[PDB]
Every structure is written in structure tokens, then in C-alpha cells.
Amino acid sequence: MRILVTNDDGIQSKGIIVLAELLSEEHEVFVVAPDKERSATGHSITIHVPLWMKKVFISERVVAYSTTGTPADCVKLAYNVVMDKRVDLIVSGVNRGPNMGMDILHSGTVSGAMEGAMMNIPSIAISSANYESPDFEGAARFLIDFLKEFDFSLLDPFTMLNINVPAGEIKGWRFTRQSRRRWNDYFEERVSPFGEKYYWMMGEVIEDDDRDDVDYKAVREGYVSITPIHPFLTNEQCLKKLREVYD
Amino acid sequence: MRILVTNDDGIQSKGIIVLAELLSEEHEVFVVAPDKERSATGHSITIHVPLWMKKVFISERVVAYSTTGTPADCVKLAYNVVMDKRVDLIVSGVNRGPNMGMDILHSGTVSGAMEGAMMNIPSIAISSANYESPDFEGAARFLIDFLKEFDFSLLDPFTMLNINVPAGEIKGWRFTRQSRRRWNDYFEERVSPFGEKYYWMMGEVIEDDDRDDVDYKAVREGYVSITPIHPFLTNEQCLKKLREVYD
Numbered sequence: 001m002r003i004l005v006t007n008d009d010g011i012q013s014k015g016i017i018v019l020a021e022l023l024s025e026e027h028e029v030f031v032v033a034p035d036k037e038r039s040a041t042g043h044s045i046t047i048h049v050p051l052w053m054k055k056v057f058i059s060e061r062v063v064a065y066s067t068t069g070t071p072a073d074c075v076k077l078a079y080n081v082v083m084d085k086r087v088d089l090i091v092s093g094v095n096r097g098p099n100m101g102m103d104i105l106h107s108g109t110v111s112g113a114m115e116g117a118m119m120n121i122p123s124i125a126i127s128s129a130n131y132e133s134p135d136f137e138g139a140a141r142f143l144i145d146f147l148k149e150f151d152f153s154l155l156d157p158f159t160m161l162n163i164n165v166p167a168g169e170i171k172g173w174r175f176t177r178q179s180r181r182r183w184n185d186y187f188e189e190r191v192s193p194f195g196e197k198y199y200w201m202m203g204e205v206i207e208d209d210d211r212d213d214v215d216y217k218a219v220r221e222g223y224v225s226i227t228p229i230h231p232f233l234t235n236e237q238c239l240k241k242l243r244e245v246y247d
Numbered sequence: 248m249r250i251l252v253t254n255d256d257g258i259q260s261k262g263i264i265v266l267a268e269l270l271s272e273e274h275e276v277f278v279v280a281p282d283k284e285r286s287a288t289g290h291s292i293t294i295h296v297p298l299w300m301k302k303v304f305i306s307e308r309v310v311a312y313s314t315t316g317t318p319a320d321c322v323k324l325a326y327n328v329v330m331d332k333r334v335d336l337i338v339s340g341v342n343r344g345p346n347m348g349m350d351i352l353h354s355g356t357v358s359g360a361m362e363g364a365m366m367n368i369p370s371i372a373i374s375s376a377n378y379e380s381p382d383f384e385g386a387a388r389f390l391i392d393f394l395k396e397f398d399f400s401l402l403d404p405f406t407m408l409n410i411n412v413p414a415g416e417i418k419g420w421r422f423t424r425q426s427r428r429r430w431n432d433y434f435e436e437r438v439s440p441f442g443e444k445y446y447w448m449m450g451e452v453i454e455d456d457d458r459d460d461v462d463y464k465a466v467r468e469g470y471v472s473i474t475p476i477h478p479f480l481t482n483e484q485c486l487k488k489l490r491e492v493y494d
């Protein structure tokens with residue numbers, strides 16, 4: 001099948017290269033990713049200025065291009081300009097560091113796969129859960145095995161899979177729900193050479209979920225976390241309550 | 248609701264047209280059916296040669312395509328290329344004639360709905376239990392009412408419903424088990440103009456099930472037969488015996 005690979009750490013990232021190589025063993029792989037590493041860009045897209053692409057190679061069996069856009073921009077370009085609107089699977093990763101809880105909202109890795117989900121194409125976001133010491137190969141190999149055991153018809157429309165792989169040894173895998181893991185921000189103030197102060201964003205993690213089947217608890221125990229997510233943010237319970245009171 | 252409608256009698260059958268027109272009154276209907284008779288094709292699929300489709304609108308609220316494939320091919324084509332993997336319900340019928348007992352093994356109607364079950368999509372096979380004098384409208388009317396009261400969450404994975412509606416009065420509905428109804432086969436021999444003999448398959452029905460809750464008994468009493476079936480044929484009882492003996 002025709003597979004599209006992208007990421008948010010840049011086309012030269014080892015995380016995207018190993019992933020492309022392994023997948024190219026049995027499928028037609030196309031790589032379209034940012035020319036340079038992106039930060040917490042969330043689901044940003046480029047509409048106010050033009051986008052540019054550059055054909056670069058990584059090896060045979062794989063056609064690759066780097067772009068001046070975001071991960072979502074990359075998926076839009078690959079689908080319309082490079083793959084003739086014929087894409088069977090989209091994989092965004094392997095990211096350096098975890099993408100769990102509310103942090104998924106500002107994740108470029110997740111954004112790439114979510115763009116695929118909005119187009120109704122089977123998509124997967126995969127991250128190695130250790131920023132300091134990532135294991136790109138381990139995450140990529142897990143993915144190859146998982147694909148042979150997963151029934152994609154079970155993935156509902158506009159739905160993608162957010163996967164986080166433990167950096168150490170993998171005990172197994174679990175289907176999880178997104179946690180409420182978030183951060184308690186704060187800033188450190190400093191002064192520039194001009195006497196003007198600037199601020200550095202900092203923070204401490206908050207893990208207070210009471211449910212046992214959330215993403216970070218699985219990873220903490222050495223299990224791969226697999227969460228099905230979609231682009232629908234309506235709080236149904238709240239909506240029902242509002243309608244009952246204001247009927 | 249996005250409903251996929253197919254059949255095994257052919258895209259121009261009165262049974263599929265009646266069903267499609269009535270469902271389109273409240274739902275978004277997509278019809279993908281064979282371009283010819285395929286009643287006794289069973290669960291055959293096309294993998295050695297290409298498949299083709301032809302748009303053949305039937306109305307405004309309904310999009311229709313005929314195909315050179317089998318009923319099962321129709322469902323695969325509908326889900327993957329016509330409906331963009333967005334299917335809420337699959338209905339195969341209304342077939343002209345009954346589909347009960349062992350006859351479901353060679354039924355194109357049941358095969359199409361089974362393709363749905365294999366993808367864990369709510370699916371229904373519906374037939375008007377009288378080949379010579381069917382009541383397509385009646386069967387359709389019944390389904391429409393059934394869809395408004397049945398709770399599909401009750402269906403187990405890989406499970407579909409095989410429904411047979413009496414052609415006369417419908418006294419009500421009953422959840423049944425598949426019967427062992429089959430036929431006493433035999434061939435009539437004839438000779439061609441060139442001296443070569445050919446054979447015509449013929450038969451007489453065998454109704455010898457001693458259980459009272461089987462499909463054909465319900466239909467004979469004037470009640471709709473609703474049987475939950477799945478793609479598993481292992482004879483558990485026999486398997487346990489063979490092991491307890493050998494091993």
C-alpha cells in the first residue's frame with residue numbers, strides 16, 4: 001500500500017528516517033516533512049503566505065521532500081501534490097518525547113496524523129516516551145508488529161490512533177483513554193542588554209488522574225499506550241445539562 | 248444516517264428499488280449492487296480480475312452504482328471507494344424469496360450483509376419469504392419500523408441479522424435460530440441439438456427440524472424470523488470429543 005510519513009522534529013531526524021526505512025521493506029513509502037525541527041506548533045496551517053517544497057533523498061524505495069510548512073501543511077501537500085490523492089496510511093513520528101494528556105493540543109506530531117483523520121485516512125501518531133533518551137528503533141519495530149495485528153475497520157470515521165511507546169523494555173500494549181495530565185506553568189524573569197526584561201516559560205507536571213486506564217499510567221508501567229482520538233471537542237454531558245436548564 | 252443498500256437479484260430489481268426509495272425518505276442512501284442476477288453466488292469475491300462500477304442514479308436523495316462484481320464485492324467497493332469508509336448501516340435486500348436454513352450458505356443476500364459483520368458494522372439481510380408472490384413493500388415497511396426500536400448495541404462483535412418476512416400477514420416478530428432446512432437434490436437429464444447431454448439441477452425441500460424456535464417455523468406461523476449469525480463454523484461439541492479421545 002501507499003504510505004505517507006511525516007513528523008515535527010524535521011526531515012533529518014533519526015526518528016523519521018528509521019521509520020521510513022522499515023516501512024519501505026514491503027510498501028511504497030512517501031516522506032513529506034518540515035525542513036527543520038518545529039516546536040509546540042499545535043494544529044497550525046499556512047494560509048497567508050505560499051509554501052515551498054524541496055526534493056531530497058534518504059534512500060531508494062522512498063520518495064522524500066522537505067517543506068517550509070507545518071506537519072499539517074506537509075500532509076495536505078503530500079495528498080494533493082505528491083500522491084495523486086491516493087493514500088492508504090499516514091504515520092507521523094517517531095517523535096522525540098511523549099505526547100499525552102492535554103499536551104496533545106500543542107503537539108505537531110499529533111497534528112500531522114489528525115490532518116489525515118480529518119481527510120478520513122487511517123492515521124497514526126507515534127512517539128518515544130523519553131525526551132532525554134529516546135528509542136526510535138524500538139518504537140518503529142513495535143509499529144511494524146502492531147500493523148500486522150490491527151484491524152483498521154475498527155477505526156471509526158475521522159478517528160486516528162495516538163501511540164506512546166515506553167523507552168525501556170516493552171511489557172505489552174493497552175488501548176487507553178486520554179488523561180488530564182497537564183502543567184503548572186510559571187516564568188523566570190531576566191534582563192536583556194538593553195535593560196528590558198524577558199520571560200522564559202517553565203513548569204511542573206500535574207498527574208492527578210484517578211482512572212487507571214489513562215495514557216501515562218500505562219507507559220509508566222512499561223506498556224505501549226494506544227488512544228483513539230478524533231476532532232470533536234463538544235462536552236456532551238455539559239451540553240445535555242445546559243439544554244435541560246435552558247429548555 | 249448513511250445507509251448502504253445492496254442485494255443479489257440485481258440493481259434493477261423491484262425489491263432493492265422499493266427498499267431504497269423508502270429509506271431515502273429519512274436517511275442518506277447509497278446503492279451499490281450487481282449488474283446481473285447473483286442469487287446463488289454465495290460468498291464469492293473477485294480477486295483474479297479487475298472490478299468495474301457504473302453510476303446509475305435512481306433518485307435525488309440516493310446515489311446508485313451498478314458493478315460487475317458479486318454481492319460481497321459490492322460491500323467492499325461501497326465502503327472503501329463510494330462511501331469514504333463512512334457507513335452507519337448495511338442492508339441487503341429485499342430479496343425475492345426466502346433465505347433460511349442451510350440455504351444461507353449459497354445466498355448472495357446473506358453474503359453481502361456478512362461482509363458488513365466482518366467489519367463490525369451493523370448489517371441486515373432481509374428477504375420476502377415467497378419467490379412466486381413476494382411482498383417487497385411490506386418487508387420494507389417492517390424494516391423501517393424495526394430500525395426505530397431495535398438497539399444495535401445488543402449485537403455482539405462480528406454479528407449480523409438474517410431476517411425473513413412472511414409475504415402474507417405479519418403477526419409480529421421472533422428471534423430465531425438457524426434451521427437445518429435443506430434439499431433432496433437430483434438432476435434432470437436432457438440432450439442438446441449436437442448430441443451432448445446436459446443437466447438441470449432440481450430438488451424438493453426437506454423440513455425436518457424438531458426444534459420449535461427455528462427460522463422457517465416462525466415464518467410459516469406468520470411471524471418475522473430474526474436470526475443473529477456470525478462467521479464461525481466450528482462444531483464445538485465434536486471438537487471436545489476428538490480431543491478427549493486423542494491428544
Ligand SMILES: [Mg+2]
Nearest residue numbers: 008009095096
Ligand atoms: Mg517533536
Ligand SMILES: [Mg+2]
Nearest residue numbers: 255256286342
Ligand atoms: Mg436473490
